[PDB]
Amino acid sequence: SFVEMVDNLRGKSGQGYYVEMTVGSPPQTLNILVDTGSSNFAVGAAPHPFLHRYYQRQLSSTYRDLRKGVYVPYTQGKWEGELGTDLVSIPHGPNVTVRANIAAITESDKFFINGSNWEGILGLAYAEIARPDDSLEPFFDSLVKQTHVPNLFSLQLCGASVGGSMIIGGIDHSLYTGSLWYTPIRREWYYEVIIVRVEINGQDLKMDCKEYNYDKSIVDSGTTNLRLPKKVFEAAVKSIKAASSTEKFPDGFWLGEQLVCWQAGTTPWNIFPVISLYLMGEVTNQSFRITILPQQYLRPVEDVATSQDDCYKFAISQSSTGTVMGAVIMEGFYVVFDRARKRIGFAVSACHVHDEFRTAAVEGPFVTLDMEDCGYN
Ligand SMILES: C[C@@]1(c2cccc(NC(=O)c3ccc(Br)cn3)c2)CCSC(N)=N1
């Protein structure tokens, strides 16, 4: 039943979308970040200032210690944990319980964030990027092996008490309108895809399309921003600046380190361009585009202290590890992770972004003469 799964996600702007899960016997309830950009199931398992609660292994009679540790450094933050297995369920997901690997986080630095309301991360990507290595079976692989659940899930993330839906085992048509367009998964590690063209307010960036995928492009619900390779980022910022030049932006705004604010309701959306990302289609040299509005890439901040005005952070940033289509891109689209057919689908979601003049869209097909492979691999 997909209806029971609708609206099973919550979150805070720029804080992460999480689903309720249980671990252990009897079940211990925790909120878990849904992350298509990693492959470990990892949960706080010791007290922490920012943790509202944690996994208590000694209180679970079904816990099995794997007698192995794991250290996972990120660019920002890090945690250390002990690997084990236990019974895991998703109360508002599939009606099943499975035994899964769990990394019990016993030490961390700048990993858990105050007020996020999640206590762990559910890595939904593939084993190749699991830590400490690809022999640690990811949760979704365990789910499919141990149950009759079809090998796919879909995410409908809705921007700013319900934050969206994770539907496991199929597609819920009530969550999107129009056509569902599919792009192939290039390699099963991250959810890697190929961008073939980029336009900003209708204007082609006219780069070799391999530049858009240097050194990979991925779909990642565990990253807030649209992250772009240096060359593409500079070109995008140049275009957006030119379009919005009628207004001055604080030092550091384009680096994402500063807010811009307007009086309530007066945000000049119309001076900001739409961004179109064309994704490789399922047929040779065909593609489709998803169009991103400023309502997506100018992310609202919901801090009470700033609430007299409407303030935003620039949610596009520079990457040295490839393009990342993060949450601000996924928001408003229904995104189908069709692992069974090695493809990802996009459709306009019931909570898609729009104003009176413009709307997020998924459109195709588009045809390209140049037969170059846009893969950087
Ligand atoms: C595991 C890792 C990770 C670790 C620690 C926090 C996070 N994400 C967030 O805090 C986060 C915040 C707002 C949104 Br919207 C989505 N995610 C992600 C590593 C960095 S990139 C990634 N996808 N996953």
Q: Length of the chain in residues, anyone?
A: 377
Q: Distance between CA 124 and CA 138 in Å, rounded?
A: 7
How far is the C-alpha of 201 from the C-alpha of 6, rounded, in Å?
Answer: 34
Pocket of ligand 1 (CB under 6 A): 14-16, 33, 35, 37-38, 74, 111, 121, 220, 222-224, 327
What kind of experiment solved this structure?
Answer: X-ray
- Asked if residue 281 lies in contact with residue 365, where contact means CB atoms within 8 angstroms, the answer is yes
Residue with tokens 């192939």: 184
DSSP three-state, residue 246:
coil
Which atom of ligand 1 lies closest to the CA of 72?
A: 1
For residue 291, the CA-to-ligand 1 centroid distance in Å is 23
Ligand 1 atom at minimal distance to the Cα of residue 37: 23
| 109 Cβ contact partners less than 8 Å away, ≥ 6 residues apart | 77, 78, 79
Q: Provide the token pair at 216.
A: 């990979």
Q: What is the dihedral of CA 68, 43, 149, 288, to 10 degrees?
A: -110
Residue with structure tokens 């922490």? 48
Note the resolution in Å, 1 decimal: 1.6
Give which of 167, 169, 212, 168 is closest to 192, Cα–Cα.
212
d(CA 33, CA 256): 23
CA 13 to centroid of chain Cα atoms: 13
**Strands 316-319 and 226-229, bridge-based pairing:** parallel
Residue with the smallest CA separation from ligand 1 atom 24 is 222
The rounded Å distance from CA 100 to ligand 1 centre is 21
Alpha carbons 93 and 21: distance in angstroms, whole number: 9
**How would you write 27-66 as a 3-class SS string?**
CEEEEEEEECCCCCEEEECCCCCCCCCCCCHHHCCCCEEE
- CA-CA-CA-CA torsion sign (234, 267, 354, 164): positive
Q: Between the CA of residue 249 and those of 228, 230, 239, 301, 317, what are the distances in Å?
A: 21, 21, 15, 16, 16
Distance CA 269, CA 252 (A): 20
Nearest to 67 by CA among 83, 55, 85, 43: 83
**Residue-wise burial string across 118-154, b where 16 or more C-beta atoms lie within 10 A, e elsewhere:** bbbbbbbbbeebbbeeeebbbbbbbbbeeeebeebbb
| CA 32/CA 38 separation, integer angstroms | 13
At a CB cut-off of 8 Å and minimum separation 6, what does 75 contact?
none
Dist. CA 371 → ligand 1 center (Å): 35
d(CA 218, CA 377): 12
Please give the Cα distance from 210 to 214 (Å, whole number): 6
Mutation probe of ligand 1 site: the residue of 51, 74, 156, 299 with most atoms within 8 A of C-beta: 74
Give Cα 41 distance to the centre of its chain: 16
Work out the end-to-end distance of the chain between its first and last CA atoms, rounded to an integer number of angstroms. Answer: 39
What's the CA angle centered on 333, arms 21 and 273, to 5 degrees?
135
Active site residues: 220
Is residue 333 a contact partner of residue 152, using CB atoms and an 8 Å limit? no
Q: Give me ligand 1 centre to Cα 247, in Å.
A: 32
Phi, psi for residue 136 in degrees, rounded to 5: -90, 100
Backbone angles phi, psi at 262, to 5 degrees: -125, 160
Q: How far apart are CA 83 and CA 247, in angstroms?
A: 52
CA 283 to mean position of chain CA atoms: 26
